């Protein structure tokens, strides 16, 4: 059979020339039964057609088609918990959008589709239905009607098989939760497979770390209340007895590094089997096989068990893979952030041997920038090479600007408002620019800041900061003055270590003192500067312009940021003034915090904080009183009122600036003051030492299901402040404020957890060793950031 | 986002002109790939901002043998002839049923006339009645269907 010409029935949207461009059969061809079947299913594979019939006229071979209906609109009904536009976006992604055609054989898959989304967020009674209304000119108008129903919540997380540990105390470390107190953010009661998955891993590790080497998970069951509003999960476990590690035999393609791998699998026998201590050396081996070129070194450990001794012999098998080479590291998706910004985070080098782990390191290095919604990594074999390979990163960029209101409430600050606007990836340069504001009882602080996190390629940062602080000493429990400062800082930050940071920078400050109630300490400083103001009239002013070289060192080896349980944080930070400044001083402060645990589950840890500060003038001038050190309060010596510890003002007789009875003043000639006057209100010193010792304990009364969520301390706090230029000789009647031997001490209990209002710290302290002047404050607290 | 509404309008570009590198003697330049290789398509066409980018009942056909060859395909296609006036060169057909492949079926009676029109001969098919699913009612669709069936016979 030869075709003289080809004719078309039922072509509407599809151009004759498009259908004609799709067919194997051509004009003037000798076609048989199998050739026409091969174009019938070519036309079908176009996806423009509902039914294709290709049959023979005499001369002509004619094509009958029914074109799939063209969507006229997509509308959404009863879709409460998901917004029309976002859900219209997912439909376009999957191939259903206005102007494109609908195959009527997927309208069910469409519902089953986004209805299956609802099951993911636990609306198990959800029901989405497509009604596809026909219109003239072969169009449809599909509306998806939704019945979201009610979200289902976990009624119970039961464990069965557990004898050595109570069900409740195991659930303690679970992400999925069956009970969430009103006053505690332990998580939602909402189900996800991902949560259960990592939770069965938390359960498996928990056991293996305690030497349960033959611990298996026999089965997991997620049941479902008929009404579909309640979810019951049950793990069934066999927790075979404890086992000490006998030895470890390494057996596979070691690439003749058998020498160094016995150093990685050295163990002191008798030591209990430990699942993470096992994974450590599976990764130590896999790391130095990586160190010798190999992409995907596989290590797999199989505990060989002997019940006579009750020992386990670790049979580790390892076969180093092949070597491969990265020819290109591509980045697709970065449509706003420049290539260097995400390239400089890579630990895999281009034009070098790949490490399966170095490309993984380089992925979450991009996630922790927080510049990308998603970060997916693909490793392709470069065509026609046995070992060369491309590594591409597929990023989805997110809006990285933000406004952030903060409200907090503490006994040191009252309400504190944080508020600022922030852009972390300025025009996709990795540049952080932001305007930030702080405001409590005693100070308001506004700053503008630009940072380059990679001044140099190795990630030393160069800071940049205009600030404005406005301080009211009265509202901070101090001898009343007011500082209205402003200036500029530029600081390099050098990383030297995963655990150590350095920073060095210069900075101008313009202090502007006024409203100073005359005292001898504040005055002897002003006489250092050469300024000689009225000793009787608290309408005064002093304006310094300082230039300061600032340095600092921070060490952080805290095993975890929240509820630290092991290792130390240490922060040293110093100031000294380059000559040409009005003032001539230096200052150094050192903070220490050391956690050592005393049990294996890390539920009893002792903590040693120490806070040291020292400063003094250089050219016979003094250190300003506005740079003084303070002590006492919830942050330092708990039980004492904020800044109460140290030297107290001794006032002059002066005239109060706006006098008003029914208002107490301190040495106003208006109340018959003749000579100098002792006081309660503190001024602080240029030399401070505080040191506490908390004893972190399990919290004793609430459920072990969420007990780990709250941390009880018992603390013994000590501290002193003093000033060294205090003329003890000249002020013989008054106490010796140059004597540091005056150590204040307090004991009490502290609670700490995360509530709906934010993170709490309740300190209830009791000052048993308190000196005259020192003001007590036994109950202190903090809600949010303060 | 806002950066796109300033490309999409008019902005122009005169980037560094291309120039072939000369190879020193005693060596050659790497082999040219050919992927990013601009052909020299000549002509004076307007370049950017001067370039107009705005986008640019009855069916009759023309073709002794003529008339008897028309009544012949209608007889071989199994359409009943109602009124056959060979003299006036105009016939009437009974209700012809079509298929195509869409919705519910359309059915019509026609008037096929063949009379000379200058140096050629015309075949004029007029759709008399059009009853779809027993409901007289698209108009060009089924006049051209009948005109196509006689045209394929020719």
């Amino acid at each position: 059979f030869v075709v003289k010409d080809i004719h078309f029935e039922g072509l509407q949207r599809v151009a004759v020339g498009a259908a004609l461009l799709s067919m194997p059969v051509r004009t003037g061809d000798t076609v048989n039964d199998e050739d026409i079947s091969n174009t019938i299913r070519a036309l079908f594979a176009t996806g423009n057609f509902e039914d294709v019939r290709v049959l023979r006229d005499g001369d002509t071979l004619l094509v009958q088609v029914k074109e799939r209906p063209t969507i006229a609109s997509i509308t959404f009904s009863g879709n409460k918990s998901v917004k029309d536009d976002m859900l219209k976006q997912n439909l376009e992604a999957s191939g259903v959008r206005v102007g494109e055609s609908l195959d009527r054989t997927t309208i069910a898959d469409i519902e089953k589709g986004l209805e299956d989304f609802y099951y993911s967020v636990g609306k198990y009674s959800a029901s989405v239905k497509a009604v596809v209304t026909p219109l003239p000119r072969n169009r449809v108008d599909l509306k998806l009607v939704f019945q979201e129903g009610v979200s289902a919540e976990i009624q119970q997380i039961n464990i069965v098989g557990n004898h050595a540990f109570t069900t409740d105390e195991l659930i303690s470390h679970f992400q999925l939760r069956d009970e969430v107190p009103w006053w505690n953010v332990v998580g939602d009661r909402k189900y996800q497979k991902q949560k259960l998955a990592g939770d069965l891993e938390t359960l498996r590790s928990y056991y293996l770390d305690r030497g349960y080497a033959r611990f298996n998970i026999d089965s997991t069951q997620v049941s479902l209340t008929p009404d579909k509003k309640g979810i019951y999960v049950t793990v069934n476990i066999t927790e075979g007895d404890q086992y000490k590690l006998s030895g470890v035999e390494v057996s596979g393609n070691l690439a003749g590094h058998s020498a160094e791998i016995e150093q990685l699998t050295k163990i002191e026998p008798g030591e209990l089997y430990n699942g993470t201590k096992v994974t450590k050396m599976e990764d130590d081996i896999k790391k130095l096989l990586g160190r010798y070129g190999y992409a995907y070194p596989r290590v797999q450990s199989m505990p060989e068990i002997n019940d006579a001794d009750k020992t386990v012999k670790l049979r580790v098998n390892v076969d180093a893979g092949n070597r491969f080479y990265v020819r290109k590291i591509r980045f697709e998706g970065n449509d706003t952030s420049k290539d260097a910004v995400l390239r400089r985070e890579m630990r895999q080098m281009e034009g070098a041997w790949l490490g399966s782990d170095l490309v993984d390191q380089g992925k979450e290095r991009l996630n922790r920038l927080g510049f990308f919604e998603t970060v997916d990594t693909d490793t392709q074999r470069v065509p026609g090479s046995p070992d060369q390979v491309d590594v591409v990163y597929k990023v989805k960029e997110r809006n990285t600007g933000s406004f952030n209101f903060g409200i907090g409430y503490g006994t040191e600050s009252g309400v504190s408002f944080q508020a600022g606007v922030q852009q972390d990836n300025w025009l996709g340069t990795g540049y952080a620019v932001g305007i930030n504001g702080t405001k409590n009882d005693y100070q308001t602080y506004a700053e503008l800041s630009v940072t380059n996190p990679y001044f140099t390629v190795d990630g030393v940062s160069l800071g940049g900061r205009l600030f404005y602080n406005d301080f009211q000493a009265d509202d901070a429990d101090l001898s009343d003055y007011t500082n209205k400062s402003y200036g500029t800082d530029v600081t390099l930050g050098f990383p030297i270590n995963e655990y150590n940071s350095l920073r060095a920078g210069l900075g101008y400050v313009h202090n502007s003192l006024s409203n100073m109630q005359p005292q001898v300490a504040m005055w002897r400083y002003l006489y250092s500067m050469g300024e000689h103001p009225s000793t009787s009239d608290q309408d005064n002013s002093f304006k310094t312009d300082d230039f300061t070289f600032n340095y600092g060192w921070t060490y952080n080896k805290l095993d975890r940021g929240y509820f630290p349980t092991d290792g130390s944080r240490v922060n040293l930070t110093g100031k000294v003034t380059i000559p040409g400044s009005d003032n001539e001083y230096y200052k150094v402060t050192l903070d220490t915090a050391t956690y050592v645990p005393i049990d294996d589950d890390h539920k009893w840890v002792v903590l040693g904080r120490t806070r040291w500060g020292y400063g003094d003038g250089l050219g016979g001038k003094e250190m300003p009183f506005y740079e003084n050190f303070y002590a006492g309060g919830s942050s330092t010596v708990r039980g004492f009122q904020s800044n109460t510890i140290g030297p107290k003002a001794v006032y002059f007789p002066h005239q109060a600036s706006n006098y008003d009875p029914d208002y107490d003043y301190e040495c106003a000639t208006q109340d018959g003051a003749k000579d100098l006057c002792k006081s309660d209100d503190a001024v602080g010193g240029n030399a401070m030492a505080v040191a506490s010792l908390e004893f972190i304990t399990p919290t004793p009364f609430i459920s072990d299901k969420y007990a780990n969520s709250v941390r009880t301390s018992f603390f013994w706090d000590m501290g002193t402040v003093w000033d060294t230029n205090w003329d003890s000789s000249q002020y013989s009647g008054y106490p010796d404020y140059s004597d540091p031997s005056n150590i204040r001490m307090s004991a009490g209990i502290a609670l700490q957890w995360m509530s709906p209002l934010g993170p709490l710290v309740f300190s209830y302290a009791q000052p048993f060793k308190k000196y005259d002047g020192d003001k007590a404050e036994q109950f202190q607290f903090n809600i949010g950031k303060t | 986002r806002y950066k796109r509404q300033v490309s999409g309008d008019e902005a122009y570009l005169e980037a560094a002109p291309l120039a072939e590198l000369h190879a020193p003697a005693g060596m050659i330049l790497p082999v040219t790939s050919g992927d990013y290789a601009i052909p020299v398509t000549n002509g004076s066409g307007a370049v950017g901002k001067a370039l107009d980018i705005r986008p640019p009942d009855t069916a009759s056909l023309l073709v002794n043998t003529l008339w008897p060859q028309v009544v012949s395909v209608l007889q071989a296609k199994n359409y009943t002839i109602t009124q056959r006036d060979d003299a006036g060169q105009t016939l009437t057909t009974d209700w012809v049923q079509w298929n195509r492949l869409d919705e519910d079926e359309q059915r019509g009676r026609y008037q096929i006339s063949v009379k000379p029109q200058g140096y050629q001969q015309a075949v004029t098919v007029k759709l008399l009645n059009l009853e779809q699913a027993g409901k007289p009612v698209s108009m060009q669709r089924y006049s051209t269907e009948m005109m196509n069936v006689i045209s394929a016979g020719l």
Binding site: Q12, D335, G351 | D9, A23, L29, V31, P39, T41, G45
Partner: protein
Amino acid sequence: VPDNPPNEIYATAQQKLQDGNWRQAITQLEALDNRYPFGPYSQQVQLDLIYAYYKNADLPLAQAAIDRFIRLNPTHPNIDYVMYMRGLTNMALDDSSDRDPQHARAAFSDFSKLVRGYPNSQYTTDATKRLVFLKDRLAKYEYSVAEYYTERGAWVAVVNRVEGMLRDYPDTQATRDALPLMENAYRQMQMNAQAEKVAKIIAANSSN
């Protein structure tokens, strides 16, 4: 949108395209095309709509419409226009140079298809002017990744990168500026036999 006759809706939307207010010319074209998605004047409303989407910087909607046009009318007289247009929309998304060139070589690929297939296009003289820009633009991309790796000290990566620039984009400005980086990489790995070779190449060629 109203439901007037199509004749006056096309008239309405035409005099909204002539006033350069595309937001309303779209909402009437969209309605006309959704209601009459085939017909003899159906292609004209589809062209006007991809023009409107483009000038209102609705570039995803413009691409989605251009690709559906080319799928259903690959032999239509004015697919030289439709192709020229998907070149512009892709070159708009580019927005140039150190960011993802996926939109640039998409643009390039299309402008190449325009000139190979329709060398006598009214849009071909302008098109060739555009993929002369796009060439050294995605040469500039390779230059910047070469430039990063020379700061990193990844000499193997930088010579492999500029070797690729000589291969893919030899007649560009970016590759002239790139050669001294190759020469450096060689010298840094004490492969100064090879450095001396690329040293001869820069010494024998314009910076222009």
